[PDB]
Design a protein around this ligand. Sequence first.
Ligand SMILES: CS(=O)(=O)NCc1c(C(=O)O)n(Cc2cccc3ccccc23)c2ccc(F)cc12
Ligand SMILES: [Zn+2]
Length: 219
Amino acid sequence: IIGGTESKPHSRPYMAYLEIVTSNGPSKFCGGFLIRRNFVLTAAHCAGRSITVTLGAHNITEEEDTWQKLEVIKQFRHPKYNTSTLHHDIMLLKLKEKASLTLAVGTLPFPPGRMCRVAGWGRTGVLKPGSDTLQEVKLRLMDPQACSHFRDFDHNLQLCVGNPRKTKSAFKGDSGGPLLCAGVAQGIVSYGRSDAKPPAVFTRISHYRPWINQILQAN
Ligand SMILES: CS(=O)(=O)NCc1c(C(=O)O)n(Cc2cccc3ccccc23)c2ccc(F)cc12
Ligand SMILES: [Zn+2]
């Protein structure tokens, strides 16, 4: 998160930190969010061989009594996910078991106004480290025209997020995190410019509600 603030600890109790063993070799990290006791929503590009989800966290180097760490048993990557265009960058994760609902661990409920918020443990600048602590930032939902420079941008599938006159943005490390507008999840962090210039591109959750509901009904 660029230009944001450290979240109040445990104030976003749906947030999930994902550790992904790369089908090749080492680990990578993404965000995600708990939508049911045993389901997490994240980006398709975060997929890998095996996934661990950490719930209840604030500082990821600091185990607390709030933590619940759960193995993913099934990855449901969107079938039309396209590595080239990055369309349908969405993925459901089934947890080996149900999370205990606590103050620090909770599910996120399912058109938006302009001001939204996003959280994550990603980089705090172009060449900065990832954040040990959960950061958050308020961002403006932009007209699709503001993202016309992204060749594969499709208003039906995606949100255009972040006023270009400011540095405030999701960035690398924030993939899979939810965009909330008025307490409702509208978006999922997907991609943007490598120079961190807003806006960035988020998956439009509403378009995928049939598919989500389908997987939840069958699992
Ligand atoms: C660890 S991972 O599983 O996420 N893989 C690396 C990766 C990232 C990342 O580091 O998060 N992002 C997001 C991202 C990238 C570059 C610029 C961005 C500007 C804004 C927001 C997000 C941005 C990807 C998008 C498409 C993709 F195929 C791979 C990646
Ligand atoms: Zn704490």
